[PDB]
Amino acid sequence: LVHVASVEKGRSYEDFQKVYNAIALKLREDDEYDNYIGYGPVLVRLAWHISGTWDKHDNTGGSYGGTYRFKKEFNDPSNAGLQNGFKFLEPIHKEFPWISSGDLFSLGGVTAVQEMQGPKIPWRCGRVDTPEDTTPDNGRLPDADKDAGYVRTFFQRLNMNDREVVALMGAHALGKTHLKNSGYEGPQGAANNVFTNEFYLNLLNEDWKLEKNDANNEQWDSKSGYMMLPTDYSLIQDPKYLSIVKEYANDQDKFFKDFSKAFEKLLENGITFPKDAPSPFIFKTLEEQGL
Ligand code: HEM
Ligand SMILES: [K+]
């Protein structure tokens, strides 16, 4: 399988900047979602989820084909709750119908990160919608009740090393777990809609207590009222992961550069960018444009 990126006929940077701004303005507007968290978090997760189905072995899955839009993928249990971000995007797609789905799902994630004060994430256009039959089966997204070895093993399927994994997990600082979605409940910290290194800080500074939740699952609960998944907790259990956590806890900038690179990589896995493809775009945030 080869998926060559193909620029949407006749579109340039400026056209994308507009999709961006449209997402951004809508984020600003619908701020009541999930009790004032806003849609930022769910969009980052949608973008990660449409991309985590990838398999470096056979090149199936990944964000290229916009398969999330099909039933099999859309109804994946590990995708519970993502429908809210889908619906958020929907009007947007209507306003800009020439964008491919993979392009849009992924741009939402970038927009989300940047609008929430995170780092700038270079983004590339060119994903092409593929047919219903290219939809990966359910089962490729990771479980949360595991440990560091699982995570390690899991992420390898996506070509991510220790450093990327840890960088990538910092996104857990955003949003929260929801009992009805995954059988877990609670936020990871206090600033849940502004992008920071809080995740690492929390993991190193709170005094976590293992407990069972209402869904009969285990989670690490802290006095502050925060929770961590077994998989999140696992980053302190593993020696290699822990030194990285420590690095990010001390230097938000390193975290940001690392997250940036990894997130783009993550969204670009499985895609072949031809030689003449335009360079990756760096979008202006609403504020940078004075809107
Ligand atoms: C071991 C790998 C991962 C596991 C098992 C995991 C699983 C989870 C769980 C179970 C949820 C809660 C969903 C809910 O009930 O609504 C979730 C929340 C979320 N996940 Fe992950 N995740 C992992 C990797 C990541 C990565 C790589 C990203 C993005 C870079 C990330 C971003 C998010 C975000 C932002 C939230 C909050 C969503 C919201 O507030 O609705 N996750 N994660
Ligand atoms: K979270």
Side-chain angles (χ1 to χ4, degrees):
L1 257 163
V2 197
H3 295 307
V4 183
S6 182
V7 193
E8 283 104 337
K9 173 114 113 282
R11 290 320 158 176
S12 48
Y13 176 50
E14 321 92 55
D15 297 272
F16 285 108
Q17 182 65 262
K18 291 197 273 222
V19 182
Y20 175 111
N21 289 184
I23 290 164
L25 289 157
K26 191 176 189 349
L27 278 173
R28 186 194 278 177
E29 177 167 75
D30 287 27
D31 70 349
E32 287 207 350
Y33 179 74
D34 210 359
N35 70 262
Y36 314 80
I37 289 160
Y39 289 87
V42 83
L43 288 199
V44 168
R45 206 186 179 230
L46 172 57
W48 125 252
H49 267 215
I50 55 92
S51 305
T53 50
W54 193 61
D55 201 331
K56 59 145 91 151
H57 290 121
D58 58 13
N59 212 210
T60 55
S63 68
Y64 184 89
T67 48
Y68 174 67
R69 92 195 181 258
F70 295 119
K71 268 359 138 32
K72 199 207 262 159
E73 191 168 345
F74 188 90
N75 295 329
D76 184 350
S78 321
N79 281 340
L82 288 188
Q83 50 280 97
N84 295 322
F86 184 71
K87 296 151 211 269
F88 174 101
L89 291 172
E90 196 207 85
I92 277 127
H93 211 184
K94 271 191 207 174
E95 210 156 327
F96 308 83
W98 49 264
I99 192 156
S100 56
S101 301
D103 280 357
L104 181 64
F105 294 155
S106 64
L107 177 53
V110 168
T111 310
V113 166
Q114 312 200 167
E115 277 313 283
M116 277 189 306
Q117 287 156 258
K120 277 323 181 80
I121 316 277
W123 175 89
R124 297 174 99 137
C125 65
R127 315 184 174 59
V128 182
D129 288 19
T130 58
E132 188 156 13
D133 45 292
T134 59
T135 306
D137 290 104
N138 295 349
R140 306 194 172 205
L141 293 170
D143 281 349
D145 58 353
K146 266 64 190 199
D147 60 355
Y150 170 89
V151 167
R152 192 170 265 112
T153 281
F154 174 89
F155 276 106
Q156 255 298 289
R157 197 195 71 223
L158 307 177
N159 258 293
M160 291 298 171
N161 61 15
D162 292 352
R163 164 169 309 272
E164 305 171 313
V165 171
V166 179
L168 285 184
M169 213 97 38
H172 270 180
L174 315 163
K176 78 182 274 287
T177 67
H178 305 79
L179 213 78
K180 302 253 165 171
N181 294 347
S182 56
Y184 297 81
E185 175 64 35
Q188 291 49 68
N192 53 163
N193 69 2
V194 37
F195 201 96
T196 73
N197 68 179
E198 203 182 345
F199 178 78
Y200 305 113
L201 288 163
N202 287 3
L203 227 27
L204 300 176
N205 310 136
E206 301 276 306
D207 153 45
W208 309 96
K209 250 65 244 161
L210 176 80
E211 287 143 52
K212 266 213 172 121
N213 69 26
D214 293 310
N216 220 213
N217 291 321
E218 316 238 23
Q219 47 180 267
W220 292 94
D221 291 337
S222 90
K223 51 128 213 268
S224 306
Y226 307 146
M227 68 77 90
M228 289 288 168
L229 298 158
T231 52
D232 297 306
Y233 202 65
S234 104
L235 310 171
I236 61 184
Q237 295 171 320
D238 185 270
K240 279 155 151 187
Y241 283 159
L242 191 241
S243 44
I244 305 171
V245 170
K246 300 207 196 166
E247 191 178 346
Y248 294 154
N250 252 78
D251 180 25
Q252 172 163 294
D253 310 324
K254 179 58 186 199
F255 167 44
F256 274 22
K257 298 159 238 236
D258 298 355
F259 183 83
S260 195
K261 276 148 24 210
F263 194 64
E264 175 169 20
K265 165 157 166 185
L266 170 87
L267 299 178
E268 295 178 353
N269 274 347
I271 310 152
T272 304
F273 292 101
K275 209 225 173 215
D276 54 311
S279 305
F281 293 146
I282 276 111
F283 299 110
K284 299 267 189 59
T285 50
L286 283 187
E287 177 185 331
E288 264 156 356
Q289 299 165 266
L291 308 175

